[PDB]
Amino acid sequence: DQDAYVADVDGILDVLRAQVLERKPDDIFQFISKSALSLQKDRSCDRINCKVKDEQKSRALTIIVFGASGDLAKKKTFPALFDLYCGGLLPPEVNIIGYARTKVDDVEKWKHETLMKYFSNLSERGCHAEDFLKHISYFCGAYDSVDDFKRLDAVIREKENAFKGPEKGGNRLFYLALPPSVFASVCESIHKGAMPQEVGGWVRVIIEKPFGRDTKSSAELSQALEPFFDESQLYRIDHYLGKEMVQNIITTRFANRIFSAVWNASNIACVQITFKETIGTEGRGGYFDNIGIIRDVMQNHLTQILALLAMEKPRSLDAECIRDEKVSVLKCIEPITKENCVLGQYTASADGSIPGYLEDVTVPEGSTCPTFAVMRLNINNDRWAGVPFILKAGKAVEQKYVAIRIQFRDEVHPYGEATQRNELVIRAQPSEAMYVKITTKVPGLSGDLRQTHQTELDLTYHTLPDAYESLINDALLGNSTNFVRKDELDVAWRIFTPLLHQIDSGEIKPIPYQAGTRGPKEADEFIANNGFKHQ
Amino acid sequence: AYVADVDGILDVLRAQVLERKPDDIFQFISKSALSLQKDRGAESCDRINCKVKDEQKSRALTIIVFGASGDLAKKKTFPALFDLYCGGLLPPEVNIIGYARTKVDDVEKWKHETLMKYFSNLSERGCHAEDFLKHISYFCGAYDSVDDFKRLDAVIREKENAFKGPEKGGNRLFYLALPPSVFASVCESIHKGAMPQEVGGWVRVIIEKPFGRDTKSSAELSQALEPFFDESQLYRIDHYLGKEMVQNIITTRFANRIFSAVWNASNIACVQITFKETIGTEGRGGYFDNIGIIRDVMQNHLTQILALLAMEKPRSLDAECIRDEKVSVLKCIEPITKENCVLGQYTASADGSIPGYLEDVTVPEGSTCPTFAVMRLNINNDRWAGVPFILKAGKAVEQKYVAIRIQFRDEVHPYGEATQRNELVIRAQPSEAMYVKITTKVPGLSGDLRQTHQTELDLTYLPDAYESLINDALLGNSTNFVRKDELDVAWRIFTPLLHQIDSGEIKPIPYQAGTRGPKEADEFIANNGFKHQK
């Protein structure tokens, strides 16, 4: 026959084909030619050794991703899982199963084209993807069928008992890449049929960002999940808590005495946390019309950043005392009122390239949901009294940008106008950076030592995986330091719910602004009145 | 032979990598390379940059450099004046004349080979070198002859009378590039014969160190010059006060609340001011033997840096406000004791390349003179109580650099052994640099959270400092000149220790050249609040 050689030839054609779809229009005639030509010298080769702890290899692990046909598992969950295999963090005998109600004609065509198509670029690393796909299986069934979960458990129990390790049984990790409405039925089916083998093994369930839309809707949803799983088993991922630069916030603050001495109201004059984004709704205005920018990236993302910035020192580095301070600081904030808020809704841009938010057909006529929102929070405690906290977010803005911008009070004496406010910036995207801006005397001889200029002490990028998989590694370790807790969720909703009821009741209206600008100019007038000085 | 030039440029890149920023070396070599191109742009000697104030040109100006044939005026003073002319800072009609006892033949030949030979190595680029020499002149005479000053006054009066401006009279700046013992006679000759013309002008007198060798001998010297000139007219230069990084110490502290909030004993755990030099005495041992390193670079240079670091905030940037705070902070310092000192004296290197300090022919055998000295100072005020202040200076050591190294108190509880002390480093030589060291999470592993690594926040942004001090004296900005009350109080801090080392109560510890110093000195640094480690 022609043994073994077939696997190498098939391992080429699937690699280009995923790039052909991502390359998209136009004609693919040249795309096949030079990409394989680039691989000739790209062709590692040593199998990556397991960096995983010896304790994790003691007994079997199973990873079940519900909604494998869903948009999140395709573009994010599974591609993140492949990234962990390249790092060796997965045990060698790991078993992955994709669960979805959709019928699948043939799994082998499906994994080669529906899942690997979103994989991270594989010109230097594509050969390892073929070995990775052997671990993946697929399981068709309903999310509410206790019978199918009794059928799925029989499949997991075989590989759990086939494991080659001193310990027996199996740990299980479920990833609910599902709409929130489906979450309750799945955990019921897991509790009635998918619980770990009695001989041993733990269970943990990851759930996705949407937790209702107000303080009451989120509270009952967690109440629905209480009977089936406790807080230690639930892992409410936030997209940003796994980010490198924001995990540094707990270290940049407390590990350094210089920052801790000035992290108080006596020195800090203003704090702002912006989430700027140049994209519009991208034709999915109805998917965003029911949300709004406040609950999309402000109640969840910027609030988690504000919690890490304003939290009191944890008693230890244990995950819960860190999260305990994250909740205690959020309880000092009185709920936002409409006087402290400014909304915006992007219109057709002067370029003519971006249709206005109302120009999209999916958006209901007369919509007042905000595409832009700047607001001030007020922390009532001895550390942060009187200090503005300006949260800002918006789509279709002048530039893609998310960063912190603390601004310390300047001491006008002696220098007066020769000096200005110090500020510490912590940027996460487009690129990670941190720097402190200060005034220093100019090198030229000048005179009176008054010829000064602003100067920054840039961190010099002292030294990969996206936060979606970095949190996946934390759930595999059981750390849970970077996952939202339910008490942390209820207080974050309480800050915004009274304001969210007012915008839903029409008491305030968005301010129009055409796309590609900074936003409504009233928002800049609002930021100027809340402690933001600038050069 | 055509290929030889290329090899040298790459070697200077090697030194910067080990010196600082020893992380992600790939990108570091790139940015350091482009900066070297601007180190000399080979700018054409076309226009002259006349940035000097027009009001400085309003009246005739004259500069008198006594000892013009002397070693200091030959290699530094006159070359510095040429750089100020290349910078355009001198008035177009400026007159400078040299004073020395020796008679000279063919004076135009003398400056062309004895003085221009030591001009800055920009002379290949300095097209107007001989044009600058036309302002120079020579004068032979005694330093104590009031008659020679009365004829020197007639020469200056002629050049002052040739000035072409509405203002009358002439301004006069005397540079005493002379041993200090001559200073009492020169100022007496200036007073009785060389004072500025009555119609207008001003007089200013630059004097060089040593400013005595003890508190009383310094007070005798200042009182000897007291009748002839006031403090506003006297300018006691210190070589370091003109350097950019130390002038920035006042700006780094009080212009920024961040440093201002932590510049106190609540946050500062230790302070170190180090002066290291690979160079040995190198055959000139006799002149250093009666001085010693304590009064060579510590009582003057390092003490001036310590005053700028610990001084209370001036009420204003006026020059007198800064010196006033410099004296009050020094008054809180109790004089150094013999227990707070460890002396050293370098010997022949293990390779034998640099001869030992006693191998030099000039040094008397058995000398107790120190080539090395580490000391602790104790400031006693609400801001600096209990914080060690470690001064250090030494010749023929492992490395040539001078830097400040603050160490902030470690925050133990949040991370335990995962973190360490913060540091703020301010180096001036070999190259200017400032950076603050901090602990940050190391990117990579999602868990642990105790995994951290030290990192620096480097600052990111030619008239040499000797020229800047002369320009400060011409402009009347006395901010960078030690005052009389500032000087004698600095002597009182050191003299009781200086009387002990002269009396032999402590003697230098031998140490081989090219090492950090005596091993006893390092444990003394560890025993007085220093604790930086990997």
Ligand SMILES: NC(=O)C1=CN([C@@H]2O[C@H](COP(=O)(O)OP(=O)(O)OC[C@H]3O[C@@H](n4cnc5c(N)ncnc54)[C@H](OP(=O)(O)O)[C@@H]3O)[C@@H](O)[C@H]2O)C=CC1
């Ligand atoms: N995806 C993205 O780009 C982003 C995601 N998010 C948020 O993360 C969350 C991820 O949700 P996501 O998976 O992307 O949304 P999807 O709507 O794409 O997923 C729906 C999945 O659940 C199944 N499902 C639900 N109800 C039914 C039903 N009656 N009948 C059959 N199938 C049903 C679907 O079919 P089947 O069961 O057959 O598989 C499908 O697989 C979202 O809430 C989103 O707000 C945030 C930022 C970006």
Ligand SMILES: O=P(O)(O)OC[C@H]1O[C@@H](O)[C@H](O)[C@@H](O)[C@@H]1O
């Ligand atoms: O919120 P966004 O637009 O998805 O950006 C998230 C990503 O932004 C990138 O800059 C980071 O490298 C990733 O760690 C991060 O996941």
